[PDB]
Amino acid sequence: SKRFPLHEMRDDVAFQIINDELYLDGNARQNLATFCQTWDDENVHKLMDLSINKNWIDKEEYPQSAAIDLRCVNMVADLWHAPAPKNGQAVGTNTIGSSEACMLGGMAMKWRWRKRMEAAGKPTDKPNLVCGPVQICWHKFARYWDVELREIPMRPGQLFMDPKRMIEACDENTIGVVPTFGVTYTGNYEFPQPLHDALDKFQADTGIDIDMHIDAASGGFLAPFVAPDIVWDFRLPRVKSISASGHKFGLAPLGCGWVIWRDEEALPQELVFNVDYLGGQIGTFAINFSRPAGQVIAQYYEFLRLGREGYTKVQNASYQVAAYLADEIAKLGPYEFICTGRPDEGIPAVCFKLKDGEDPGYTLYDLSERLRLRGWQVPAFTLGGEATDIVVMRIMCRRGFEMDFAELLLEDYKASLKYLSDHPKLQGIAQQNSFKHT
Amino acid sequence: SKRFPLHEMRDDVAFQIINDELYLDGNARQNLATFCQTWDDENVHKLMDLSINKNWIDKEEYPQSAAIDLRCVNMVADLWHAPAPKNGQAVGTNTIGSSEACMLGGMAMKWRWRKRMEAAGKPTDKPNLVCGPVQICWHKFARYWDVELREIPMRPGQLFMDPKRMIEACDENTIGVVPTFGVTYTGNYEFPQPLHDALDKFQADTGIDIDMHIDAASGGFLAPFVAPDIVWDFRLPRVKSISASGHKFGLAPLGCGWVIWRDEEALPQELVFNVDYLGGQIGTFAINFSRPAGQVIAQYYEFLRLGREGYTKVQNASYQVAAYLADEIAKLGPYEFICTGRPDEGIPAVCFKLKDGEDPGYTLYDLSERLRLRGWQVPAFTLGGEATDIVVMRIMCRRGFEMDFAELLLEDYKASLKYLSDHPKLQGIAQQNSFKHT
Amino acid sequence: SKRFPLHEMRDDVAFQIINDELYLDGNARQNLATFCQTWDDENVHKLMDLSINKNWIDKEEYPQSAAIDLRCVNMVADLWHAPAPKNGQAVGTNTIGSSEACMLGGMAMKWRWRKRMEAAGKPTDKPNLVCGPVQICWHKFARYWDVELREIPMRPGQLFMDPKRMIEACDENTIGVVPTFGVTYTGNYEFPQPLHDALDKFQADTGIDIDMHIDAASGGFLAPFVAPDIVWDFRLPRVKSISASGHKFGLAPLGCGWVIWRDEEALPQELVFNVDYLGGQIGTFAINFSRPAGQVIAQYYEFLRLGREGYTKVQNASYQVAAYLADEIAKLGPYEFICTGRPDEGIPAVCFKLKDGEDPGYTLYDLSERLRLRGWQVPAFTLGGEATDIVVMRIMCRRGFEMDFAELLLEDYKASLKYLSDHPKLQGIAQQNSFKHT
Amino acid sequence: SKRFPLHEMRDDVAFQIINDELYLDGNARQNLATFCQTWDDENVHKLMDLSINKNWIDKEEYPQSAAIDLRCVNMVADLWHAPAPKNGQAVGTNTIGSSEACMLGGMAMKWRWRKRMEAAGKPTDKPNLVCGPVQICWHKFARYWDVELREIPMRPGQLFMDPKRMIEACDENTIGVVPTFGVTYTGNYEFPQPLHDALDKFQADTGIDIDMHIDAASGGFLAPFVAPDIVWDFRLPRVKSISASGHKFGLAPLGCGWVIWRDEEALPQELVFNVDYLGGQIGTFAINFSRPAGQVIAQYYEFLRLGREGYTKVQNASYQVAAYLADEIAKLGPYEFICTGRPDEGIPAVCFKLKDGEDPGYTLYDLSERLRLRGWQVPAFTLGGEATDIVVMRIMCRRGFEMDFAELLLEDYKASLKYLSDHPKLQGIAQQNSFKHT
Ligand SMILES: *[C@H](*)c1c(COP(=O)(O)O)cnc(C)c1O
Ligand SMILES: *[C@H](*)c1c(COP(=O)(O)O)cnc(C)c1O
Ligand SMILES: *[C@H](*)c1c(COP(=O)(O)O)cnc(C)c1O
Ligand SMILES: *[C@H](*)c1c(COP(=O)(O)O)cnc(C)c1O
Structure with missing residues (x-):
């Protein structure tokens, strides 16, 4: 052993x-x-x-x-x-x-x-x-x-x-x-x-x-x-x-x-x-x-x-x-985007956070967990410096992740939102940061 | 290109x-x-x-x-x-x-x-x-x-x-x-x-x-x-x-x-x-x-x-x-061994040099070249420090190099020696160190 | 399309x-x-x-x-x-x-x-x-x-x-x-x-x-x-x-x-x-x-x-x-077993439910979800006949699922229990039968 | 055993x-x-x-x-x-x-x-x-x-x-x-x-x-x-x-x-x-x-x-x-076709029978056996209902069966006919229906 x-x-x-x-x-x-x-x-x-x-x-x-x-x-x-x-x-x-x-x-x-x-x-x-x-x-x-x-x-x-x-x-x-x-x-x-x-x-x-x-x-x-x-x-x-x-x-x-x-x-x-x-x-x-x-x-x-x-x-x-x-x-929600997949702004990624003040009935950590149950790993994590009070979700779009896969992700995303709304007791439980490459 | x-x-x-x-x-x-x-x-x-x-x-x-x-x-x-x-x-x-x-x-x-x-x-x-x-x-x-x-x-x-x-x-x-x-x-x-x-x-x-x-x-x-x-x-x-x-x-x-x-x-x-x-x-x-x-x-x-x-x-x-x-x-020659493949002394390798004040008609560099023409790469090189003028040949015996392969090397070695003896003008021509892992 | x-x-x-x-x-x-x-x-x-x-x-x-x-x-x-x-x-x-x-x-x-x-x-x-x-x-x-x-x-x-x-x-x-x-x-x-x-x-x-x-x-x-x-x-x-x-x-x-x-x-x-x-x-x-x-x-x-x-x-x-x-x-819990993998009673499966009137702070549906987040699909479902009220968890042991994988499952099982204990609001939320071959 | x-x-x-x-x-x-x-x-x-x-x-x-x-x-x-x-x-x-x-x-x-x-x-x-x-x-x-x-x-x-x-x-x-x-x-x-x-x-x-x-x-x-x-x-x-x-x-x-x-x-x-x-x-x-x-x-x-x-x-x-x-x-013979591979009448198949009253010295059952000796399985069988006395040969043309395979089939077909002509005693011997998918 x-x-x-x-x-x-x-x-x-x-x-x-x-x-x-x-x-x-x-x-x-x-x-x-x-x-x-x-x-x-x-x-x-x-x-x-x-x-x-x-x-x-x-x-x-x-x-x-x-x-x-x-x-x-x-x-x-x-x-x-x-x-x-x-x-x-x-x-x-x-x-x-x-x-x-x-x-x-x-x-x-x-x-x-x-x-x-x-x-x-x-x-x-x-x-x-x-x-x-x-x-x-x-x-x-x-x-x-x-x-x-x-x-x-x-x-x-x-x-x-x-x-x-x-x-x-x-x-x-x-x-x-x-x-x-x-x-x-x-x-x-x-x-x-x-x-x-x-x-x-x-x-x-x-x-x-x-x-x-x-x-x-x-x-x-x-x-x-x-x-x-x-x-x-x-x-x-x-x-x-x-x-x-x-x-x-x-x-x-x-x-x-x-x-x-x-x-x-x-x-x-x-x-x-x-x-x-x-x-x-x-x-x-x-x-x-x-x-x-x-x-x-x-x-x-x-x-x-x-x-x-x-x-x-x-x-x-x-x-x-x-x-x-x-x-x-x-x-689909009260989000403030940090990155939107624009060629002139950065890499093929989507990064967003909940707007300040807005409380849709779930945190991004909770949403990440629901998606994981659908087989998707969409990382939610806190930023550093003087922005550690911010939680974001970042989606990376690599070679192989085609439009039809994204369509499926959106369906599961909506399904995850409906579930969170139907079961309010879920909000706030998820608190661990996923692997974020750093 | x-x-x-x-x-x-x-x-x-x-x-x-x-x-x-x-x-x-x-x-x-x-x-x-x-x-x-x-x-x-x-x-x-x-x-x-x-x-x-x-x-x-x-x-x-x-x-x-x-x-x-x-x-x-x-x-x-x-x-x-x-x-x-x-x-x-x-x-x-x-x-x-x-x-x-x-x-x-x-x-x-x-x-x-x-x-x-x-x-x-x-x-x-x-x-x-x-x-x-x-x-x-x-x-x-x-x-x-x-x-x-x-x-x-x-x-x-x-x-x-x-x-x-x-x-x-x-x-x-x-x-x-x-x-x-x-x-x-x-x-x-x-x-x-x-x-x-x-x-x-x-x-x-x-x-x-x-x-x-x-x-x-x-x-x-x-x-x-x-x-x-x-x-x-x-x-x-x-x-x-x-x-x-x-x-x-x-x-x-x-x-x-x-x-x-x-x-x-x-x-x-x-x-x-x-x-x-x-x-x-x-x-x-x-x-x-x-x-x-x-x-x-x-x-x-x-x-x-x-x-x-x-x-x-x-x-x-x-x-x-x-x-x-x-x-x-x-x-096969006037050699002084530094390593002879002993388990108690080091790794499975053979390292030797010509004995001091012994010129057999070729340097180890010349021998290495003859062997190269036969497909073998047996490195000859000078040592460092206060042995800078010492030339050695080192043979690594890795997994796969079986006994019959070693027997072929010996036959090629002997043939290389006979050729060097038959063509004395070859002596002293080769002078470049081969890759020695360092 | x-x-x-x-x-x-x-x-x-x-x-x-x-x-x-x-x-x-x-x-x-x-x-x-x-x-x-x-x-x-x-x-x-x-x-x-x-x-x-x-x-x-x-x-x-x-x-x-x-x-x-x-x-x-x-x-x-x-x-x-x-x-x-x-x-x-x-x-x-x-x-x-x-x-x-x-x-x-x-x-x-x-x-x-x-x-x-x-x-x-x-x-x-x-x-x-x-x-x-x-x-x-x-x-x-x-x-x-x-x-x-x-x-x-x-x-x-x-x-x-x-x-x-x-x-x-x-x-x-x-x-x-x-x-x-x-x-x-x-x-x-x-x-x-x-x-x-x-x-x-x-x-x-x-x-x-x-x-x-x-x-x-x-x-x-x-x-x-x-x-x-x-x-x-x-x-x-x-x-x-x-x-x-x-x-x-x-x-x-x-x-x-x-x-x-x-x-x-x-x-x-x-x-x-x-x-x-x-x-x-x-x-x-x-x-x-x-x-x-x-x-x-x-x-x-x-x-x-x-x-x-x-x-x-x-x-x-x-x-x-x-x-x-x-x-x-x-x-690991207040369980009542229906099947325990005995050759003289049935197939290589483990089937159990929570003991009646016993509440460990979670339903087997909740435990199943925690295990899913860890990569395991261990079905939890209600029985048929006149027992559509009883919830059981069934584990099938097929060829390939060897002892060490079972040990890993246990580790994740215990980890899931601890998480459920540290997060009591998760109790009772999950309520959907998983595929059970019938 | x-x-x-x-x-x-x-x-x-x-x-x-x-x-x-x-x-x-x-x-x-x-x-x-x-x-x-x-x-x-x-x-x-x-x-x-x-x-x-x-x-x-x-x-x-x-x-x-x-x-x-x-x-x-x-x-x-x-x-x-x-x-x-x-x-x-x-x-x-x-x-x-x-x-x-x-x-x-x-x-x-x-x-x-x-x-x-x-x-x-x-x-x-x-x-x-x-x-x-x-x-x-x-x-x-x-x-x-x-x-x-x-x-x-x-x-x-x-x-x-x-x-x-x-x-x-x-x-x-x-x-x-x-x-x-x-x-x-x-x-x-x-x-x-x-x-x-x-x-x-x-x-x-x-x-x-x-x-x-x-x-x-x-x-x-x-x-x-x-x-x-x-x-x-x-x-x-x-x-x-x-x-x-x-x-x-x-x-x-x-x-x-x-x-x-x-x-x-x-x-x-x-x-x-x-x-x-x-x-x-x-x-x-x-x-x-x-x-x-x-x-x-x-x-x-x-x-x-x-x-x-x-x-x-x-x-x-x-x-x-x-x-x-x-x-x-x-x-190549006195045949009455039922299917000739027309897209407007059916599938890519050829189905035929000997014309009524015509006797070329062989039955389709016999021709089928001759073709089998040449490696081909071309089914011959009797129809049902009120055509129980009708024997047909059906040739299915699937993907992979190219024109040159067909040309070869024809040469073997002709060869089989010649053999039947030279050996008249073969006529009427074969009497078993081949697999016809039904
Ligand atoms: C991924 C990453 C690295 C590390 O590169 P590796 O190839 O993983 O060693 C360094 N800097 C940035 C900005 C990165 O995204
Ligand atoms: C080969 C060697 C190294 C270098 O190891 P690598 O695996 O090539 O990086 C270091 N030290 C000694 C003594 C070596 O022989
Ligand atoms: C799995 C199962 C079946 C169905 O068998 P399949 O091979 O899926 O068609 C029937 N009866 C019982 C008791 C089973 O477990
Ligand atoms: C081949 C055939 C069938 C049977 O189909 P399978 O795919 O072999 O089950 C049924 N009907 C007709 C008309 C057929 O030719």
Whole structure:
């Protein structure tokens, strides 16, 4: 049970035991809380099966996996408008996910800032990072790398880091600013452009030059296709690096993330380690070492098969569903929407709360429980900062969640409302927050 | 081939294109350089295929995957003699590999050390780490977390960190010592026991109490089965944590690593982050967030199917082949062996060099090249520290590399020698280090 | 939107669309309400796949499928102690399920009765059928064939047809008595032996000769293996026919039923239809005509693979889990058990209710809902007969639901109780019967 | 050796034994006697495999299977011009085949009649059913439900139920008329419109109001696509119900039938039974209960993939081949055709007999045997009624039977004729009817 087994067991019996237990896991098709891919593609399955033993770090034994990874780095860099590479190869790396990507970005950000302060003869004893309602990976970064996290707290009417409060927290100890292009909590984009203008003025008034790292975990694979006019990437001079989750809207299977740097200068060479290989040593900047290359290969398949044309069609379908749900749900209760699935505002999500004062006879926690009985997982949870007095419901519309599935959700939603009305004693009982990806 | 594709392509054409390219990767069956699993098991393939979308961090949607992970943690802790958990669950976590596991162990060391010094009213801005010929992940750890790496260099006579030099580098700023229970370069174990005795005396003399973290990337899944008497794990009081690679001798597919802590006190809770889940929040101490659970499930399959009984047989087979090759190769040239595949000395590997002042007409680099033309990748490389000019050949004997495969290698080895003798001009031409996992 | 589609679409697109929505169906591994097979066997999947086009009624084109069906009929007849047939072939047939099998048995009863009456110059326009708490297929039989259904009502302290009330309902117009060897509602066996004794005495006293048809939908593939001493089958003279569901404890996949007659005399030939075939016409007594032979083939696979000893082990495991749950659940509340998974009393099920006048702060309907939120479907429903006031919870233990899953259920059971205790306003809200197979 | 096996057997041995004997079944590709699907589609195989455990009656655990079934009901009703449903859902149900469907239609018909007679103060103990050369399922219906079958006999000139002889058999005890829209014996359609006009006149002259149930086992999925203007469905007032076989020209795998009622009024609610489900009770009118939902899912796949335009193409291909064979075979002997594969007269079949008084030196029975030696099963059999002295050959052209298969059949046909000519003693030897689906 708790001990390492003493004796053997027939291969097929062991497989039989485990296979039967796994049916206890959900298939997530009715899970509207997660951001990760849950759609099945036969080709992706075959590519992953073929790559179970392909070692991502062994560029000697698996040269083509390595080659494909480099093409991916170039493509993502291009998608984000990185300046043309002098050597023809963009500066970036594949990672397990946005978490590792963000940490690599954070470290580079801290290193640049440090070397800069040292060149000015200033102490590098107490660095700080300015950001909004960031995902937990940034809290780990601040803690693990001894950096003071200056999180602009959420607050009624302004659930994001705005220019004014951002500047209020910036000083010579700020290694950089991290806008979240697709806030986990709500689905809305923190727009880098306005923040960028503020940083320019800041330099003009104080001489302090601050860089940006965009945590585009979700938005990095959305805006480029459905809202190209939004300027949030390398088109902005201060953006030295950007990270995103391939396994979210990048459409790759779980285990794929990306981080790109503006140019060679943006990435401190002190953070790159050379590794010997027969064809010459190659530098790597990663937290991991041995790991499978299947997700990189699957990511490439998605790029090759879809292109901008196909990604636009896929993301457009998600936004269409999200907008549909936002419009229909609005008609069923006294709700105040925070996100409505608009391409120009954020990701394909619907986030709302009960209007202040309004009491329809149930909280969102109660509604979430009723829906769970219908098989749906629609997360309800309290926000942070100075808005912890707010309870919201967030619906994520991923690939595979078609219009007809949304129609069914609406029927169950209405059925859940009718039930809550018929049984008033239910109101107020549900009090636990669901998994919200952070 | 550099920019993100503009137009889409037929799914099957995209697959066909990538599939054809992948034949350029090797299958590693004749690669005797890598430590990672290269053997195919139909059941492992099925479990992995079933888990492509199972999110390791989403304990809510995939509860059984989470349950299986916890069983593995307990089993590994048991295998390493961890003290009985007061709450029934061992303290530890699954990782992508030994690199992440080592970083988590390192940070824990750094944190325990901190609170130790602060308590004793002493500064904490100049920490250092004492170790031997460690794998690159530790060099990354030192650089990324600003810790002074005090690596005891290899030298003709002792290519490992010995008790004497270890104490010489130890002081009040030593956050801990890291013995490598299975040195990447040679395959030999750095025995923790002697170093442990030295650490107790160091405390009895200076009052300084230094702990250890065992990097058992390879050895953690070897000694427990074929050399139980070697005391290197939690049986030693100073060992507060141990890490190992499941995808190496743990026999799991690429993407699995483990780190276990002696008990709750060994892991600073300041490094643990809580995440909300409908069934209550759960603490996680990891660098990654979203990622697939298939490797954990496959690891469990190996534990269940093999048990101590099955692992002993698998590892015994490897040691058998290693010892055989060591015995037969010694008869082919003037060699000095560093590792001969002995269960009591290290892992299933053969490592040797030409005897000092002995020129047989070829270097090990030349031999490696002849073998490469015969399909084998047997790495030749220079050591580090004060042995920088020593060239060695290291042969890894993994699951799948059976006796008849070793017999073929010997025939190719002898043929390579005859060719080198018949063509003296080849001597000294090859000079590049092969991939050596570090 | 729901009209017959106008245009064609790509084969793989249509499949993709349907495949994706099928995830909305459950996998039933945590459904403890159904009696049907939910376990998966690769060999069964292969046999079914190979038989997709094998026509059960076309004995000419698919002679081996026909041969296999006949072997199954002989094996089932043998299992139920049917008298040895003169021509070497038992009288009986495969069906889609117990429903069709019961109707065939019902028609035969009605026919034997009619002929009996006609021979004695008695009217045949007012036939009735005596039974206990039968599954809905008998209510369908009564209505479709105009037979007065005399169902002995369940009542506190006697939820089954007892000898006394059975006789009270019998007369000259009774076509037969249907004991239910495994009552759907509770899982308990209605023992034929005592009822048979009553029918013998009834004949001796009134001259009325009444026969039985045993509805052994579940019990037919249980008692023969774990309680062979229970005399419920053909060993009893009045039992003219027996039916059972191969897809329940017969372990066959959905779509397999069986009905066996005592001998040629038990099956009126007026009900058999001869169909022309090259090798000679063959009689058929069935409601269906064209249909696949896959389930018959799979049933045969189960017979050959397991045999008596195999089935005994499979059923024994289910009885263990059931007895275990009954034993453990009793310790968690003021319950009165109706069925506790004892082999000598019924099927592997647990059925209970709250003790009269006892109020633990919840109804079983509330507990069922809490368990649903934890992924389990454990049906709670009101009884039939004259007990539509009593609410019970029934747990079915099928193949695949092993001990460890039962342990998990207990953990969730206890967790549900605690939640109900900490939230008393939940009491009495839930009030809808779950699917209970009738 | 016919008993229930005693010991277990290795799963692989049991599978091997059975797999090897199944090769004794034919693959039916050269069987031109059957109406059922014998074509293989990988997507249908995948869908069926995924649905092995999906319980058609458990709408609670398998809600999507249930929802898909309802879509199919609506689509088939639309295809047959059923009046728009007030509640949005057509009245009808999936069945295992046309046999069950016909019995359901038959019972409903008997009930509607009974209600009418009771209100009229007339006896209801002598019901009769008027029909033509119906398939065996109606003979079963008549026997099982005690209804007098008034079958208009086949006779030279008219091998079907004509208006005049239909009316001559109709009286106040007639529960209805059953036209066969695709006669099993000949492939010819019995046109409902002419019969309908006759029933209109019958009511005008006698006040006796008689309805119809169309047995469109084969024609129900043909005429709507290739002969839209044939008025045989709900477009006709007296048509209260229609049934058809999905596994015949509906292109679904074995185990799928359909029966649709004109409206709620056409279906006596006393024949519907309610079943409890967590989401509310749902009524069912079926003979069977538990069974797999795979065929329903596969039928939906065919509807979605093909649509009206696709079915038209598939059906046209079969008719093209039928017409081709009819035209060619006529040039090979003194034959009188009954069916020539015309879309406006019937299904894709070829039916013929030897001209009266003509003796080419062989009977169709002899020709059939010769073709069997060449791998073809082309049934030859005697008709009934007043044509008991007429022997015909019927060739069915199903999906998969391409033009080149037909060309091969013709070569073998010619070869068989030559052989018969060279061996005159063969004439008259063969005298057994083949399987003809009835
Ligand atoms: C999901 C998310 C992350 C974490 O990315 P992973 O791929 O899960 O490691 C980081 N930031 C934001 C804003 C996210 O939504
Ligand atoms: C292989 C190795 C590592 C790195 O482990 P990964 O599983 O590749 O991350 C670390 N330390 C040693 C001693 C190793 O051999
Ligand atoms: C399940 C059941 C039936 C119906 O059997 P099916 O195989 O679903 O047709 C009939 N009687 C009893 C007692 C049952 O439990
Ligand atoms: C084939 C046929 C039937 C029987 O249909 P099944 O799907 O085999 O139950 C009934 N009537 C006619 C006219 C048929 O051709």
